[PDB]
């Protein structure tokens, strides 16, 4: 269909002016990784960029960063024309020059720093007019090239004399400035980022179609998550990047006004925004306006929760407006806000995980120029519990520490503090570890939901259980119509039972990982909390959170916990049923047909579990998890030692021999007991620094087995008795 | 880097006009515990103080109390110039004289008490203009030395005839009065005192930098503790000592 045009799409690399083509296009465009290519754009303008070769991209989507797009005036999903330019011709000092307000308090010589490092080792091709952006010294300043000695475009060479100027030509009115947040400023919430963009792509990008079609596009979207997880960030990025007019209501501003000065700004906020359409109204802190409940007193509060309901109703789909509202927990707001036609979509931004806390950290230091040893992987490992704002606060406190150890050491403080001096400034690992030492996990801790990092590589033995579990959890999600051929419902429960420390937890996490599914762990103390606190209404919030995190594995560990707290060898006079397990029964059997929520219980006392859990439509598959065998006891010892260094001198299958049986936990005990005797040696020294066989022999002096061969027979009994 | 300048920092002793140097500096400045030293300060003014020798201080930080700093116009973290003055020359009755409102209901003869005990056993060196402060009888009254018979500075000796006056010259508008609380008025909360000063040092002391840098300085701080533990005290001291405008809701 005249394959010249191509779509624009996001790109992974940090560098500017690099487009990443789909590899089965090589000889079509005929141009390799050494050829720069001209790209057509809106208001009659272009750019030229060197090309990279990668597998994962789609065929039709060019991958390029924000700066190369803004000048093109392409917004993601737009199409550009890609035509080669082998005809490239080098320049002699293209003239480059500072812009915006960015251009903040800088002074002196910014060219040996904000240019010369960047142009070097590069040959970065530059067409006159590009905004190409540089970063250093806790700031991103971009230099627009106003003049190119040859034209239109030029490679840069190390041999072009370089022109010191530094004058502040103000940015033109019509371009929308770069400082503003795009999608690449959002680190760690991306699964849901596709979700919001999917909802809003067609309404915001294509106003014509919904006037040319019968259908209803989403009227309002409810972003919810703990505070500081980037909900405002998301709304702004989506608005800024689609180009739609972003209006911002925040609850306390509306609540700041007097009665009738309030709802006027509110009903003006939409009657102002529906002009500028397509537009996004972001109502964050929707709890401030709209907790319509028992708890509000007064008419004027109840008035404002009203009229918000009827501005939601008032948009007739001739409004191109999308309404986003940020909330913290969903029960927070008035339930009539969720009527269909007000806030129909509900999207949970959630706490970022270790794998996500990395990207956030890497977004909030892109201007710093760090120090070489800090790896941001273990920085991202000990920041657990931090939302993305906690993370932004960490690295800014890191950078204010390092500015405390240096600089004003001399007291160089002048009118405008020097450029080259902050670029020298670097922040080492001893700053960040000092940044964490502060209170910063002052944000929320509630039930986590993320893909665990335990692959099957971590579980010694249990081969048959590993394949049994895959069938239970995998085959239904992958191959449904096969289940439909025999008219079968996949069983959605499992109950692991066996002695303690045999890996019932590991297996559950391992299988969530193999599915790349979310894993919610409800541990024993949390069920006991509901049972003492007589609050089993919490079990509903647990399953609805699995439903929103689906596909997920929901794991009840120590499901016998409440049965124990009642005794159970003699125990109370009652039956097996109790408050909390009752609500687990209720919420299980009353759950949605298949949302890919798979329920795993685990127990070390299958004896005293109530049998109602067992009935079909519940945890329906009992899987015994035995004490390991020396076959497995070898892989248990290795999967523990696959991190810490273990010299060849100490040998395994002989340790794994001497134990008639231990738990996989008793073996980790031995391992960790040995590794303690080692570090004891290494800290002391020197006044050698690795593990040794005699470390493990002193460890084995304390090796105890927690399972007494009595109850294995008891466990052996529950096995054949049940079938 | 032209090691003349040095930073100002807090000091443990109760007495006035004593700066406590870092001991591995002895022969650099070449001056021992028997030499008085001239220190440069803002709006073209100085002071001279005898020196003490201690281990725990940093190398770059002079340790001196509030009174010796206020006239210097140095606020902690500022830098002053330290140059020796073995050339010291004694005075004959520097003229000293009461100031502020402090100067409250006092009367009769305050010189046998608010001066003569303090000058004694001392040789306290005094440059014309110093505010050096004395305490007695449930009040702290400070006497500014308006006139020095030789100049600029003088040791005091027990042999200088002493001038009874006691007149209330009102304090000049531009100096920020001593009665106001500093860090040394806060006794027992100090671990967190370093914490608040760490948070607020760079934003309050260096307004230029956060305009010259991308970053966000702390917007608000929440002091909490049982009532009467000095939370207002802390906020005022930090404000008064960095010099920033303190508003109180
Ligand atoms: N996922 C994220 N990626 C990058 N930055 C984030 C993320 N989440 C939060 N932040 C940072 O946290 C700060 C607070 O974000 P904001 O959206 O105001 O919080 P909330 O989510 O409560 O609305 C923002 O300045 C943003 O830079
Ligand atoms: N079969 C095993 N293979 C590897 N490690 C194990 C095994 N069993 C136990 N462990 C180690 O012991 C710890 C406790 O095991 P856990 O998963 O709690 O089992 P359970 O739930 O049966 O008590 C885990 O951290 C795990 O690393
Ligand atoms: N750590 C302290 N050191 C010295 N004085 C203190 C201290 N804490 C309290 N005070 C005294 O207690 C009085 C009450 O202090 P104030 O700051 O008003 O109380 P709060 O801490 O409730 O704000 C102040 O006059 C102050 O002199």
């Amino acid at each position: 269909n005249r394959p010249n045009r191509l779509i624009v799409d996001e790109a992974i690399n940090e560098d500017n002016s690099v487009v990443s083509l789909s590899q089965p296009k090589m000889d079509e465009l005929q141009l390799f990784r050494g050829d720069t290519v001209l790209l057509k754009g809106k208001k009659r303008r272009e750019a030229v960029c060197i090309v990279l070769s990668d597998d994962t991209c789609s065929d039709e989507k060019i991958r390029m960063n924000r700066v190369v797009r803004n000048n093109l005036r392409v917004r993601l999903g737009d199409v550009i024309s890609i035509q080669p330019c082998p005809d490239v011709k080098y320049g002699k000092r293209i003239h480059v020059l500072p812009i915006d307000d960015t251009v903040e308090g800088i002074t002196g010589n910014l060219f040996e720093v904000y240019l010369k490092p960047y142009f070097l080792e590069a040959y970065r091709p530059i067409r006159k007019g590009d905004i190409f952006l540089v970063r250093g010294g806790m700031r991103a300043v971009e230099f627009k090239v106003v003049e190119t000695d040859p034209s239109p475009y030029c490679i840069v060479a190390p041999d072009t004399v370089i022109h010191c100027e530094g004058e502040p030509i103000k940015r033109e009115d019509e371009e929308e400035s770069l400082n503003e947040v795009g999608y690449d400023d959002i680190g760690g919430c991306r699964k849901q980022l596709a979700q919001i963009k999917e909802m809003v792509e067609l309404p915001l990008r294509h106003p014509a179609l919904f006037k040319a079609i019968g259908v209803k596009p989403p009227r309002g979207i409810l972003l919810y998550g703990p505070p500081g997880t980037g909900k405002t960030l998301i709304a702004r990025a989506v608005a800024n990047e689609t180009g739609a007019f972003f209006f911002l209501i925040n609850g306390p501003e509306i609540m700041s006004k007097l009665a009738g000065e309030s709802e006027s700004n509110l009903r003006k906020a939409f009657e102002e925004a529906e002009k500028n359409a397509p537009a996004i109204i972001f109502i964050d802190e929707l709890d401030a306006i709209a907790p319509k409940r028992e708890k509000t007193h007064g008419e004027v509060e109840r008035r404002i929760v009203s009229q918000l309901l009827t501005l939601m109703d008032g948009l007739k789909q001739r409004a191109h407006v999308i309404v986003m509202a940020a909330t913290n927990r969903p029960n927070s707001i008035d339930p009539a806000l969720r009527r269909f036609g007000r806030f129909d979509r509900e999207v949970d931004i959630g706490i970022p995980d270790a794998t996500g806390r990395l990207e956030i950290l890497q977004i909030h230091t892109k201007n710093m120029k760090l120090a070489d040893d800090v790896d941001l992987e273990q920085v991202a490992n000990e920041t657990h519990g931090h939302v993305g704002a906690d993370l932004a606060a960490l690295c800014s406190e890191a950078a204010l520490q390092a500015i405390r150890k240096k600089m004003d050491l001399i007291d160089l403080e002048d009118e405008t503090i020097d450029a080259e001096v902050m670029n020298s400034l670097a922040v080492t690992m001893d700053d960040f570890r000092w940044a964490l030492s502060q209170s910063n996990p002052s944000a929320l801790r509630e039930t986590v939901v993320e893909v665990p990092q335990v692959t099957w590589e971590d579980i010694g033995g249990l081969e048959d259980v590993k394949r049994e579990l895959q069938e239970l959890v995998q085959y239904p999600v992958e191959h449904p119509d096969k289940f439909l051929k025999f008219g079968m419902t996949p069983s959605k429960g499992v109950l692991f039972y066996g002695p303690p420390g045999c890996g019932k937890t590991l297996l559950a996490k391992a299988i969530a990982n193999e599915c790349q599914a979310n894993f919610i762990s409800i541990k024993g103390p949390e069920l006991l909390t509901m049972w003492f606190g007589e609050s089993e209404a919490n079990v509903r919030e647990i399953f609805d959170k699995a439903r929103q995190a689906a596909p997920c594995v929901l794991f009840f560990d120590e499901l016998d916990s409440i049965a124990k707290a009642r005794g159970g060898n003699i125990g109370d006079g009652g039956g097996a049923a109790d408050r909390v397990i009752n609500q687990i029964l209720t919420e299980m059997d009353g759950m949605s047909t298949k949302k890919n929520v798979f329920i795993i219980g685990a127990t070390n006392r299958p004896d005293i579990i109530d049998p109602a859990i067992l009935r079909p439509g519940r945890l329906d598959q009992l899987i015994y998890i035995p004490l390991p065998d020396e076959k497995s006891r070898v892989a248990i010892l290795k999967a523990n030692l696959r991190k810490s260094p273990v010299a060849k001198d100490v040998d395994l299958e002989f340790l794994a021999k001497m134990t008639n049986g231990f738990s996989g936990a008793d073996l980790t005990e031995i391992c960790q007991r040995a590794c303690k005797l080692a570090i004891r040696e290494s800290i002391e020294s020197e006044i050698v620094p690795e593990i040794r066989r005699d470390h493990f022999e002193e460890a084995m002096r304390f090796a105890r087995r927690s399972v007494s061969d009595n109850d294995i027979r008891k466990y052996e009994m529950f096995a054949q008795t049940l079938q």
Side-chain angles (χ1 to χ4, degrees), chain A residues 196-197 199-200 204 219-223 231-236 238-239 246-247 249 270 279-286 312 321-327 343 347 349:
Chain A
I196 291 171
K197 294 165 63 176
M199 295 174 184
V200 308
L204 291 173
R219 303 193 187 179
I221 297 168
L222 188 65
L223 309 186
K231 300 183 302 300
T232 306
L233 186 73
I234 304 295
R236 288 186 188 273
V238 167
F246 179 85
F247 184 84
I249 297 171
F270 296 105
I280 288 172
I281 294 167
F282 185 70
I283 305 177
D284 59 347
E285 287 168 340
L286 186 71
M312 293 294 103
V321 308
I322 312 296
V323 172
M324 303 173 77
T327 311
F343 296 100
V347 39
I349 300 300

Side-chain angles (χ1 to χ4, degrees), chain A residues 225-400:
Chain A
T229 60
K231 300 183 302 300
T232 306
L233 186 73
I234 304 295
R236 288 186 188 273
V238 167
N240 288 340
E241 192 149 357
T242 60
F245 171 70
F246 179 85
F247 184 84
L248 187 134
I249 297 171
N250 56 43
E253 293 177 350
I254 296 303
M255 293 295 106
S256 298
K257 272 69 180 182
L258 274 58
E261 184 168 359
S262 171
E263 75 267 0
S264 304
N265 288 128
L266 190 126
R267 86 172 66 189
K268 174 170 60 65
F270 296 105
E271 180 265 332
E272 182 280 338
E274 282 180 346
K275 282 185 298 294
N276 298 277
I280 288 172
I281 294 167
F282 185 70
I283 305 177
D284 59 347
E285 287 168 340
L286 186 71
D287 295 338
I289 306 107
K292 171 54 175 56
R293 289 171 64 178
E294 65 287 8
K295 70 192 190 74
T296 184
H297 293 88
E299 178 65 23
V300 62
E301 301 85 353
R302 293 184 176 90
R303 285 172 182 169
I304 190 70
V305 304
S306 302
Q307 172 161 348
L308 175 58
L309 295 171
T310 58
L311 294 170
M312 293 294 103
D313 297 341
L315 55 85
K316 284 179 63 68
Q317 292 102 0
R318 178 59 179 91
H320 298 291
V321 308
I322 312 296
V323 172
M324 303 173 77
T327 311
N328 295 333
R329 297 199 292 273
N331 51 328
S332 304
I333 53 105
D334 180 64
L337 283 173
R338 302 190 185 179
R339 180 182 189 271
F340 301 153
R342 296 172 188 166
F343 296 100
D344 59 346
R345 303 304 186 101
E346 185 179 358
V347 39
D348 191 348
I349 300 300
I351 294 92
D353 59 352
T355 298
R357 291 190 291 263
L358 192 147
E359 290 86 355
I360 299 168
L361 287 175
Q362 298 184 336
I363 287 174
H364 290 289
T365 72
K366 283 152 70 179
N367 301 346
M368 292 190 182
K369 286 176 180 176
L370 310 186
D372 72 19
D373 53 343
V374 47
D375 288 350
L376 298 181
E377 190 182 12
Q378 67 281 356
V379 181
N381 295 140
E382 280 94 1
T383 184
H384 184 272
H386 291 263
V387 305
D390 296 326
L391 289 170
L394 187 73
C395 57
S396 299
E397 192 181 7
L400 258 53

